[PDB]
Amino acid sequence: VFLGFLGAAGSTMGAASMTLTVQARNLLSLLKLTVWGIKQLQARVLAVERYLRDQQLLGIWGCSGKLICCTNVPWNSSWSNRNLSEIWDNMTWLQWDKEISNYTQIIYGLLEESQNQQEKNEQDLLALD
Amino acid sequence: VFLGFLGAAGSTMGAASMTLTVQARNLLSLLKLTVWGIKQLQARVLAVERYLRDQQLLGIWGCSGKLICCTNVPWNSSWSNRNLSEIWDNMTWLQWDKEISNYTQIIYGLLEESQNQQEKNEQDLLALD
Amino acid sequence: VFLGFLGAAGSTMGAASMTLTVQARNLLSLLKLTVWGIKQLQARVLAVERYLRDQQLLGIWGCSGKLICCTNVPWNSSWSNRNLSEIWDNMTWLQWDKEISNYTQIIYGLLEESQNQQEKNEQDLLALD
Amino acid sequence: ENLWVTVYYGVPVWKDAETTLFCASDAKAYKKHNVWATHACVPTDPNPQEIHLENVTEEFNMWKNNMVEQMHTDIISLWDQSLKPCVKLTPLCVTLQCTNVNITDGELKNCSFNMTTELRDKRQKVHALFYKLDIVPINENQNTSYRLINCNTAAITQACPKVSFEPIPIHYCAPAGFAILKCKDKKFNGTGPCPSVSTVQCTHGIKPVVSTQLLLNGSLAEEEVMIRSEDIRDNAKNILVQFNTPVQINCTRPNNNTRKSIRIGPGQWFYATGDIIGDIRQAHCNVSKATWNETLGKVVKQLRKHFGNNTIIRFANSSGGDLEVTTHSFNCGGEFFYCDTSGLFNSTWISNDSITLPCRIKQIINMWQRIGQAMYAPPIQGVIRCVSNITGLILTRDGGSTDSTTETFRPSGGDMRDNWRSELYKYKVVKIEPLGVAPTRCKRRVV
Ligand SMILES: *[C@@H]1O[C@H](CO)[C@@H](O[C@@H]2O[C@H](CO)[C@@H](O[C@@H]3O[C@H](CO)[C@@H](O)[C@H](O)[C@@H]3O)[C@H](O)[C@H]2NC(C)=O)[C@H](O)[C@H]1NC(C)=O
Ligand SMILES: *[C@@H]1O[C@H](CO)[C@@H](O[C@@H]2O[C@H](CO)[C@@H](O)[C@H](O)[C@H]2NC(C)=O)[C@H](O)[C@H]1NC(C)=O
Ligand SMILES: *[C@@H]1O[C@H](CO)[C@@H](O[C@@H]2O[C@H](CO)[C@@H](O)[C@H](O)[C@H]2NC(C)=O)[C@H](O)[C@H]1NC(C)=O
Ligand SMILES: *[C@@H]1O[C@H](CO)[C@@H](O)[C@H](O)[C@H]1NC(C)=O
Ligand SMILES: *[C@@H]1O[C@H](CO)[C@@H](O)[C@H](O)[C@H]1NC(C)=O
Ligand SMILES: *[C@@H]1O[C@H](CO)[C@@H](O)[C@H](O)[C@H]1NC(C)=O
Ligand SMILES: *[C@@H]1O[C@H](CO)[C@@H](O)[C@H](O)[C@H]1NC(C)=O
Ligand SMILES: *[C@@H]1O[C@H](CO)[C@@H](O)[C@H](O)[C@H]1NC(C)=O
Ligand SMILES: *[C@@H]1O[C@H](CO)[C@@H](O)[C@H](O)[C@H]1NC(C)=O
Ligand SMILES: *[C@@H]1O[C@H](CO)[C@@H](O)[C@H](O)[C@H]1NC(C)=O
Ligand SMILES: *[C@@H]1O[C@H](CO)[C@@H](O)[C@H](O)[C@H]1NC(C)=O
Ligand SMILES: *[C@@H]1O[C@H](CO)[C@@H](O)[C@H](O)[C@H]1NC(C)=O
Ligand SMILES: *[C@@H]1O[C@H](CO)[C@@H](O)[C@H](O)[C@H]1NC(C)=O
Ligand SMILES: *[C@@H]1O[C@H](CO)[C@@H](O)[C@H](O)[C@H]1NC(C)=O
Ligand SMILES: *[C@@H]1O[C@H](CO)[C@@H](O)[C@H](O)[C@H]1NC(C)=O
Ligand SMILES: *[C@@H]1O[C@H](CO)[C@@H](O)[C@H](O)[C@H]1NC(C)=O
Ligand SMILES: *[C@@H]1O[C@H](CO)[C@@H](O)[C@H](O)[C@H]1NC(C)=O
Ligand SMILES: *[C@@H]1O[C@H](CO)[C@@H](O)[C@H](O)[C@H]1NC(C)=O
Ligand SMILES: *[C@@H]1O[C@H](CO)[C@@H](O)[C@H](O)[C@H]1NC(C)=O
Ligand SMILES: *[C@@H]1O[C@H](CO)[C@@H](O)[C@H](O)[C@H]1NC(C)=O
């Protein structure tokens, strides 16, 4: 049962997470001085900029190939105090992203430093012998 | 403890390697024929070209997802005869990049041929049964 | 033993597949409104778009970082009836691409659906406990 | 026995495609701003990397080549950009009153006229020499009043005296992800599969020489001379000839012309022709009869390979067209010559006394079908002499109801793209598709 791109946008966070493959596909795919040509040229560069931007963040988080990825960062109660039943079976990703918007910058900083900035050195020393 | 972009430029190679995520973030991110538009558009294209250039080498070296990557290539003494104490706890990546600049091309050639050009064929034959 | 770019174009598929790093390297690397500047800018975006096109397909196949990637798709006899000795020791990648060119779109469609569209759900359910 | 597909990234697989190629010229330091190299063309690499591909047989088609259609649009685009900041001669459409330079029983006329000046209210009357080919009468009844050839049809722009028209080698390169395949077959005709195939990133040094009938300063053919044509049995398609031994031709303009700079506005400087100091001698070109007849004889030996072992082959002067397609037109030192090739094609073939070719010189030219734009070539001060290297011909049959008894050949130049086909016949642009699937006995580890 597929609804389409952003089809589960109003769904709960648990029902929308089951269709992450849908939004991942439709996220990248005499004179040429026409105004439309300039618009097409600047739109293609704009498109690959946002695509590589998301893949860059997934690269420094050690989640390059996966769509659901677990980490080492413990969830701070100051970000949200809701229960697991109150998030995945009561809230949508839209109103959830609006609630964590004030802490997404801090989470990303800890998301790359606490683990994959530390894991690569620990994995280097674990594979030392 | 984060200092900022290029914060560990003057630090030791061992202390600088613990802040690889800092340089990784700040590395990619009627008529528009204005001189500044032409510059700005040409700067974004030049930026994403250099980013994919490095990621291109990380693909052929088998180090696509990691920031620290161990290999199979043995270090030749002709490139540098210094010990781990003199390199990681006394030298900076700047004066280290200056000392290996005469051999970085040779190292890159073995870095793509000795391992991932041989490992993937052995991975095919080992997973053949 | 390196011959150069496209050096193994006329060799067998077994001898040409050992030089995948050769073609992979040379695949990506007052007014500036001159005919040569506009062409140059449009060529650099064209270059990085063809590159990200192949990387995108390798992303939905789970083969992003590897040069030789094995899958779960069974090879149908309707595509080609030749044996491994008759393919890897008699045919080149040029004439082999011509024979399967009528089925490459069907293989690509099954290559994304048979494994990484099914594995990710099973990878989530196997690591669920 | 259990087969599974496998992804191979980097396979040597290419496909016929057309992309945007760019310029390349060597580090020639120097009088500069030539039209073709422009301000900046890509500097050629100190060492080109030509890589031969063994056991590779590729199809080539010099007539459906996209490199010619792009290059023709590149040369035309370079021409307009080098004339836009130059002085436009739109006010030079005044009624001219001319006379003949004191000889009894002339190709140039002395004309006086009113011309504008640096100031609006002030006018000047100047005298200047013009060629008869650049001037048409206005009364045809007839009086002695004339006008420019273009002023009735198209605008005219004076070429800047700083830019040069000398062709320098231009290398066409392929962008990343694309490659150019060169066919190194000595006996390679127009189309067909090429046995010996190599690959390069840029083409060789191709000099964009704008010519008619005769191909000057072109690349010679190795071994025997080559006759390439899209359809040899078709008269409507031109016949591209490539020599193996180059023929020499010396062209001179004995007239010692003088440059007469007259100001026609604020910053506008129009350079006319002053009185010729010395004798009046019309231009010409000398061709060695012994070498020309020998080379022409070497041509008919290869023409018989497509029209019977024994047949009648004749050569006559161009009977169709006017102006530039009936004469050997080319540039030499800045002035544009138009040489009558009647003395070259005056033989019939069956079973040190150099040839002279009279030439005429224009100054208002209409090249590349350009309906709308005309260029005024400024007078080159001094005596002009250039030595060229005719390496090819562009011939055309006459057809008719002949029963294959006799066969005539006449020179022509119906288009300019035939000049680039003589230097792009061996190159071919293809895109690289590095994605390839193949079955092996390998399965992904579940782990
Ligand atoms: C085919 O190639 C030959 C190469 O020799 C061309 O002849 C050469 O044309 C150049 C044009 O710049 C001549 O250079 C000029 O020399 C005069 C001499 O005083 C100088 O005043 C100019 O400033 C310029 O440097 C060169 O001399 C001439 N070659 C010889 C031996 O004289 C020929 O023009 C080419 N064919 C065509 C159609 O252009
Ligand atoms: C133009 O004619 C000249 C006549 O000499 C030819 O020039 C020589 O070619 C050989 C072959 O490489 C060189 O070794 C000489 O240095 C050349 N001399 C000069 C003065 O260039 C030349 O081959 C002819 N070129 C064409 C395109 O026909
Ligand atoms: C080609 O050759 C013909 C044959 O001579 C030329 O025709 C003559 O041209 C002269 C002028 O040069 C006239 O006086 C004659 O009346 C023409 N006809 C003859 C002699 O039968 C012709 O001009 C030459 N050139 C072209 C471009 O056709
Ligand atoms: C919309 O609401 C209905 C009823 O609760 C539910 O079954 C459905 O899954 C919801 N879909 C979305 C996209 O919210
Ligand atoms: C919890 O959150 C506060 C405020 O966001 C932060 O200052 C603190 O360091 C966090 N503590 C832990 C253990 O993550
Ligand atoms: C979690 O649920 C319990 C009820 O089982 C509730 O009392 C508690 O307040 C909830 N936690 C919150 C809202 O942080
Ligand atoms: C710079 O040198 C000082 C010397 O005392 C050292 O303590 C410090 O770690 C170095 N690196 C810095 C300040 O980034
Ligand atoms: C290091 O390189 C030198 C110079 O090519 C060579 O002679 C030597 O055998 C190499 N040693 C090792 C251990 O690779
Ligand atoms: C390492 O190299 C330094 C400098 O060359 C030298 O002083 C030292 O003795 C070497 N060995 C050790 C164990 O530090
Ligand atoms: C690299 O080569 C240059 C040129 O000879 C030389 O001056 C420099 O010392 C070399 N550096 C190293 C680290 O070998
Ligand atoms: C090949 O394709 C045909 C047609 O869909 C199908 O009937 C057959 O089972 C397939 N065989 C294999 C081995 O996949
Ligand atoms: C496969 O494609 C080629 C493309 O030229 C075509 O000639 C051939 O008939 C096709 N074969 C089948 C079985 O469809
Ligand atoms: C001037 O000379 C031309 C060419 O020789 C000639 O045709 C013309 O008749 C002459 N002028 C007059 C007025 O006859
Ligand atoms: C043009 O020249 C004639 C003499 O040839 C003169 O009578 C007339 O006044 C001039 N016109 C202008 C506008 O100077
Ligand atoms: C060129 O050679 C090919 C070789 O297969 C042949 O088919 C073709 O007819 C030839 N063309 C001419 C004009 O001789
Ligand atoms: C050209 O004509 C002008 C004006 O009639 C006259 O003064 C001059 O002497 C003539 N000179 C030549 C070379 O024809
Ligand atoms: C052309 O000029 C060259 C160089 O001066 C000379 O060797 C040759 O004999 C000349 N040819 C003719 C036909 O005048
Ligand atoms: C041309 O050369 C051939 C063969 O050398 C000879 O038979 C013929 O008479 C020559 N013709 C002329 C016009 O020199
Ligand atoms: C002429 O005939 C000979 C002998 O039959 C043959 O070898 C040659 O190829 C023929 N040449 C032409 C141009 O027909
Ligand atoms: C052509 O040659 C014939 C015979 O040699 C001669 O009578 C005629 O005048 C020549 N024509 C030209 C234009 O040279």
Cβ of residue B76 lying under 6 Å from some atom of ligand 8: yes
> Hey, which residues does D394 pair with through a beta bridge?
D240
> Hey, which residues does D130 pair with through a beta bridge?
D109
Burial A57-86 (b: 16+ CB within 10 A, else e): bbbbbbbbbeeeeebeeeeeeeeeeeeeee
Contact of D311 with D407, CB cutoff 8 Å? yes
* DSSP state string for D170-206: B--B--TTEEEEEE--TT--SEEEESSEEEESB---B
Among C11, C75, B52, smallest CA distance to D11 is for C11
Contact of D428 with D60, CB cutoff 8 Å? yes
Which residue intervals of D235-384 are DSSP H helices? Answer: 289-303
> B65 vs chain A: nearest CA distance in angstroms?
6
Q: How far does the centroid of ligand 9 lie from the alpha carbon of residue B93, in Å?
A: 18
Shortest-distance Cα residue to atom 3 of ligand 13: D106
Long-range Cβ contact pairs of D215-218 (< 8 A, separation 24 or more): D215/D242, D215/D390, D215/D391, D215/D392, D215/D393, D215/D394, D215/D419, D215/D422, D216/D249, D216/D330, D216/D388, D216/D389, D216/D390, D216/D391, D217/D167, D217/D388, D217/D389, D217/D391, D218/D242, D218/D389, D218/D391, D218/D392, D218/D422, D218/D423
Integer CA distances (angstroms), D279 to A50, D254, D275, D286, D332, in order: 74, 8, 11, 20, 21
Residue C112 DSSP symbol:
I
Integer CA distances (angstroms), D72 to B127, C4, D174, D324, in order: 55, 32, 17, 18
The enclosing H or E element of D51 equals: strand D51-53
Resolution of the solved structure (Å): 3.8
The enclosing H or E element of C41 equals: helix C35-60
| D 50-79 residues with CB < 8 A to C | 51, 53-56, 74, 77-78
Burial D144-171 (b: 16+ CB within 10 A, else e): eebbbbbbeeeebbbbbbeebbebbbbb
Contact of C35 with D78, CB cutoff 8 Å? yes
Listed in sequence order, the residues at least 6 apart from D100 whose beta carbon sits closer than 8 Å to its beta carbon are: D106, D109, D110
Residue D374's Cβ-count burial label (10 Å; 0-12, 13-18, 19+) is buried
* DSSP state string for D129-178: EEEGGGEEESSSS-TTEEEESSTTTSEEEEPPSSS------B--B--TTE
For β-strands D327-332 and D429-432, DSSP reports them as unpaired
Integer CA distances (angstroms), D149 to C115, C128, D134, D375, D413, in order: 74, 87, 5, 11, 22
DSSP-based helix, strand, coil % in chain C, nearest 5? 55, 5, 35
Q: Which of C16, C26, C36 sits opposite D22 (nearest CB)?
A: C36
What is the rounded CA–CA span in Å between residue C52 and residue D45? 28
Shortest-distance Cα residue to atom 14 of ligand 9: B85
Q: Do B25 and A60 touch (CB under 8 A)?
A: yes
Q: How far does the centroid of ligand 9 lie from the alpha carbon of residue B13, in Å?
A: 17
Encoded amino acid at D167, one letter: P
| Distance in angstroms between the alpha carbons of the first and the last residue of chain D | 22
Locate the chain B residue with the closest alpha carbon to C19.
B117
Locate the chain C residue with the closest alpha carbon to A43.
C45
Burial D188-209 (b: 16+ CB within 10 A, else e): bebbeebeebbbbbbbbebebb
Question: Is residue D142 reached through a cis peptide bond, with omega within 30 degrees of 0 on the bond before it?
Answer: yes
Q: Do B52 and C20 touch (CB under 8 A)?
A: no
Cβ of residue D123 lying under 6 Å from some atom of ligand 14: yes
Among D136, D67, D133, D63, smallest CA distance to D95 is for D136
Integer CA distances (angstroms), A103 to A62, A110, B29, D414, in order: 21, 11, 20, 72
Shortest-distance Cα residue to atom 13 of ligand 16: D275
Integer CA distances (angstroms), D80 to A37, A99, D25, D87, in order: 22, 60, 20, 13
Q: Do B117 and C67 touch (CB under 8 A)?
A: yes
- Rounded to the nearest angstrom, the gap between the alpha carbon of residue D335 and the centroid of all alpha carbons in its chain is 15
Tokens of D120: 């609006």
Contact of D397 with D313, CB cutoff 8 Å? no
Q: Which of D10, D14, D40 sits opposite C24 (nearest CB)?
A: D10
What is the rounded CA–CA span in Å between residue D10 and residue D22? 25
In this complex, is the C-beta atom of C39 within 8 Å of any C-beta atom belonging to chain D?
A: yes
Q: Any idea of the CA torsion for D300, D303, D307, D310, to the nearest 10 degrees? A: 30
Cβ of residue D304 lying under 6 Å from some atom of ligand 19: yes
CA pseudo-torsion sign B82, B83, B89, B92: positive
Length of chain A, in residues: 129
Q: How far does the centroid of ligand 14 lie from the alpha carbon of residue D272, in Å?
A: 20
CA pseudo-torsion sign B92, B94, B95, B97: positive
Listed in sequence order, the residues at least 6 apart from D67 whose beta carbon sits closer than 8 Å to its beta carbon are: D21, D172, D203, D420, D424, D427, D428, D429
What is the rounded CA–CA span in Å between residue A69 and residue A55? 13
What is the rounded CA–CA span in Å between residue D185 and residue D60? 11
Q: Do C68 and B42 touch (CB under 8 A)?
A: no
What is the rounded CA–CA span in Å between residue D141 and residue D296? 47
The single residue listed with the structure tokens 């019309």 is D282
What is the rounded CA–CA span in Å between residue A89 and residue D246? 86
Residue D114's Cβ-count burial label (10 Å; 0-12, 13-18, 19+) is exposed
Q: Do A28 and C117 touch (CB under 8 A)?
A: no
Mutate to test the pocket of ligand 11, among C71, C76, C103 (most ligand atoms within 8 A of CB): C76
Locate the chain C residue with the closest alpha carbon to A37.
C42
Number of Cβ within a 10 Å radius of residue D392: 25
**Which runs of E-coded beta strand occur in chain C?**
68-74
For C62: left if phi > 0, alpha if psi spans -120 to 50, otherwise beta; the answer is left
Tokens of D334: 């800045």
Shortest-distance Cα residue to atom 14 of ligand 11: C76
Listed in sequence order, the residues at least 6 apart from D43 whose beta carbon sits closer than 8 Å to its beta carbon are: D24, D25, D26, D27
What is the rounded CA–CA span in Å between residue C38 and residue D38? 14
Residue D121 DSSP symbol:
S
Which residue intervals of A26-64 are DSSP H helices? Answer: 35-60
**Which runs of E-coded beta strand occur in D266-334?**
268-274, 284-288, 312-315, 327-332
Number of Cβ within a 10 Å radius of residue B110: 15
Encoded amino acid at A91, one letter: M
Which residue intervals of A2-129 are DSSP H helices? Answer: 13-16, 20-25, 35-60, 84-88, 93-99, 104-111, 117-126
Residues with CB under 6 A from ligand 2: D 217, 220, 246, 389, 391
Q: How many contacts does B have with C, using Cβ atoms within 8 A? A: 63
Residue D85's Cβ-count burial label (10 Å; 0-12, 13-18, 19+) is exposed
Residues of B in contact with A60 (CB under 8 A): 21, 24-25, 67
Q: How far does the centroid of ligand 9 lie from the alpha carbon of residue B52, in Å?
A: 38
Contact of D292 with D344, CB cutoff 8 Å? yes
Among D120, D26, D7, D21, smallest CA distance to D67 is for D21
Encoded amino acid at D58, one letter: E
Number of Cβ within a 10 Å radius of residue B99: 14
Residues of B in contact with A127 (CB under 8 A): 70
Residues with CB under 6 A from ligand 1: D 166, 209, 216-217, 330-333, 385-388
Q: How was this structure determined?
A: X-ray
What is the rounded CA–CA span in Å between residue B22 and residue A55? 16
Residue B51's Cβ-count burial label (10 Å; 0-12, 13-18, 19+) is middle
List residues in chain A touching C: CB distance below 8 A.
21, 25, 28-29, 32-33, 41, 44-45, 48, 51-52, 64-68
What is the rounded CA–CA span in Å between residue A50 and residue D322? 60
Encoded amino acid at D340, one letter: D
Residues of B in contact with A65 (CB under 8 A): 65
Integer CA distances (angstroms), A26 to A18, A29, C60, C115, D435, in order: 16, 6, 12, 19, 21
Which residue intervals of chain B are DSSP H helices? Answer: 13-16, 20-25, 35-60, 84-88, 93-100, 104-113, 116-126
Locate the chain B residue with the closest alpha carbon to A55.
B65
Contact of D361 with D255, CB cutoff 8 Å? no
What is the rounded CA–CA span in Å between residue D258 and residue D398? 44
Q: How far does the centroid of ligand 11 lie from the alpha carbon of residue C77, in Å?
A: 8
* DSSP state string for D61-95: ESSS-HHHHHHHHHHHHHHHHTTTTSPB-GGG-PP
Q: By three-state DSSP, how is residue D2 classified?
A: coil
Tokens of D255: 């007239």
Q: Do B124 and D443 touch (CB under 8 A)?
A: no
Shortest-distance ligand to the CA of residue A104 = 5
What is the rounded CA–CA span in Å between residue A93 and residue A12? 7
Measure the CA angle with vertex D434, ends D433 and D436; round to 5°: 100
- Rounded to the nearest angstrom, the gap between the alpha carbon of residue B98 and the centroid of all alpha carbons in its chain is 15
Residue C104's Cβ-count burial label (10 Å; 0-12, 13-18, 19+) is middle
